[PDB]
Amino acid sequence: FNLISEKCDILSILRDHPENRIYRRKIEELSKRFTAIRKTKGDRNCFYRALGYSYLESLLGKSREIFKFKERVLQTPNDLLAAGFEEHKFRNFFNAFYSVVELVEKDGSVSSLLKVFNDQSASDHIVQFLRLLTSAFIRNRADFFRHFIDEEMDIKDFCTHEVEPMATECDHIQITALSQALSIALQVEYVDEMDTALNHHVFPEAATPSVYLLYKTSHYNILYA
Numbered sequence: 189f190n191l192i193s194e195k196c197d198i199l200s201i202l203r204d205h206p207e208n209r210i211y212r213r214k215i216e217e218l219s220k221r222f223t224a225i226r227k228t229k230g231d232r233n234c235f236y237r238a239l240g241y242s243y244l245e246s247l248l249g250k251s252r253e254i255f256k257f258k259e260r261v262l263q264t265p266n267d268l269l270a271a272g273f274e275e276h277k278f279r280n281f282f283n284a285f286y287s288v289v290e291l292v293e294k295d296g297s298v299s300s301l302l303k304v305f306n307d308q309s310a311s312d313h314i315v316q317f318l319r320l321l322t323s324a325f326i327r328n329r330a331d332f333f334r335h336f337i338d339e340e341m342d343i344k345d346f347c348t349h350e351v352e353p354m355a356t357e358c359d360h361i362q363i364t365a366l367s368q369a370l371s372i373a374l375q376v377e378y379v380d381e382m383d384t385a386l387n388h389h390v391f392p393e394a395a396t397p398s399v400y401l402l403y404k405t406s407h408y409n410i411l412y413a
């Protein structure tokens with residue numbers, strides 16, 4: 189379990205911030221709303237790896253939701269082609285993602301899903317797929333991202349340098365784009381060392397979330413309500 193941990197009690201993360209007044213306060217408050225946490229490896233891929241694992245975990249045993257998600261994933265090659273990606277270059281990454289979706293359907297266990305996400309090869313193929321789909325979704329909707337995020341940004345350069353490469357860190361744009369590309373509703377809780385309220389953001393605004401993440405010390409960990 190070197191990439192995604194076993195479930196732990198929320199208060200077990202006090203030990204990561206010993207004798208720290210603000211972090212203790214915020215973690216205690218978080219424990220009133222959430223029961224458990226899984227930690228992810230801080231290798232620069234932790235947003236993609238956490239969202240992918242936590243969303244597929246949320247589908248286990250839900251036959252209608254699995255059918256609808258599979259239908260969407262089957263169309264994603266067309267998003268990649270429309271943005272200029274070549275089939276022979278994305279094939280291995282698409283096939284790895286479709287495979288883990290079929291595991292959710294056929295096997296249906298937490299333990300089998302966690303083993304794929306802890307297999308460095310399978311897990312990194314899944315992350316690379318998610319990064320290419322993020323990039324495609326932004327490129328195909330460049331006017332949307334310039335209108336609503338930043339009129340001055342260079343969309344093609346941003347995707348080349350800050351989305352496609354492994355180990356590149358995320359901001360609001362990547363989170364919004366992957367949420368929209370796969371129709372995943374997610375809530376991010378923010379824990380920093382300023383003397384401020386524990387607070388959160390939902391993607392898209394106003395949705396009921398499937399996934400909850402904790403953003404703390406530049407890392408995305410998985411929460412359980």
Ligand SMILES: *CC(=O)NCc1ccc(F)c(C)c1
Pocket residue numbers: 229230231232233234235357405406407408
């Ligand atoms: C999500 C992810 O892989 N984060 C890696 C990380 C951990 C600590 C930091 F200070 C940075 C810049 C990144």
